[PDB]
Design a protein around this ligand. Structure first.
Ligand code: SAM
Ligand code: DNC
Ligand code: MG
Length: 214
């Protein structure tokens, strides 16, 4: 229990039910709201993530920024057999926690965790990971990467008509350059979902940006 991330994992291992994704999510959200705040998308914004997945029904989903595995577990529990969630995480210590969290929650057969920076892995997705085009992307890494990685996904041929981009924290801490680009571009159709910062009462929101073709 030397780091906050280790303490979150240990709380799950001691209080949640093995193989039960819902139980894992509830243990993380309770510990973080009351004992140690952490940057998981959380239970309130997580209901918005769930609704986007339920409506669009992606089969190939990419996540940028895994942290401790909360959002990977939350999205994977909604996917159909044979779906794939690929999640990219730059920090090795967080990647090791994420794989343990995914294993414990019972969702490992749906998840492929990649250790590395988003901008190094994105150009490898077709030839090394067998991706054709993505159905959905969850953007939740450092906010200065949202716009350059959106441009890189397009340049690498990974977006099709109907691909869903869903971005966390577009208000707090904010992603203004990303928002101005997708909202002004004729290549995206955008919807804003206003909510709150995880575990707290500061206002936040997510943006859904649906690709329309080049
Ligand atoms: C907000 S946390 C992710 C929270 C996770 N989506 C959830 O809701 O449970 C952001 C993460 O992005 C990772 N990160 C930052 N820059 C990155 C990059 N260029 N590629 C991949 N991961 C990155 C950080 O190390 C950190 O674990
Ligand atoms: O500082 N914060 O409140 C957050 C919240 C978040 O949900 C984040 O994703 C974040 N980050 O990636 O830097 C920071
Ligand atoms: Mg976030």
């Amino acid at each position: 229990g030397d780091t906050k991330e280790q303490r979150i994992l240990n709380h799950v291992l001691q209080h949640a039910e093995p193989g039960n994704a819902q139980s894992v999510l509830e243990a993380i959200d309770t510990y973080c709201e009351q004992k140690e705040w952490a940057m998981n998308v959380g239970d309130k914004k997580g209901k918005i993530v769930d609704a986007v997945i339920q409506e669009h029904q992606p089969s190939v989903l990419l996540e940028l920024g895994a942290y401790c595995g909360y959002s990977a577990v939350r999205m994977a529990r909604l996917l159909s057999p044979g779906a794939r969630l690929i999640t990219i995480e730059i920090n090795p210590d967080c990647a090791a926690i994420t794989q343990r969290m995914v294993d414990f929650a019972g969702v490992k057969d749906k998840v492929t965790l990649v250790v590395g920076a988003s901008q190094d892995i994105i150009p490898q997705l077709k030839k090394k990971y067998d991706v054709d085009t993505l159905d959905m992307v969850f953007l939740d890494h450092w906010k200065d990467r949202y716009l350059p990685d959106t441009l890189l996904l397009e340049e690498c041929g990974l977006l099709r008509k109907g691909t869903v981009l869903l971005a966390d924290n577009v208000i707090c801490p904010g992603a203004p350059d990303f928002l101005a680009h997708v909202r002004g571009s004729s290549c995206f159709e955008c919807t804003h979902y206003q909510s709150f910062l995880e575990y707290r009462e500061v206002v936040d929101g997510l943006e859904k940006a649906i690709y329309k073709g080049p």
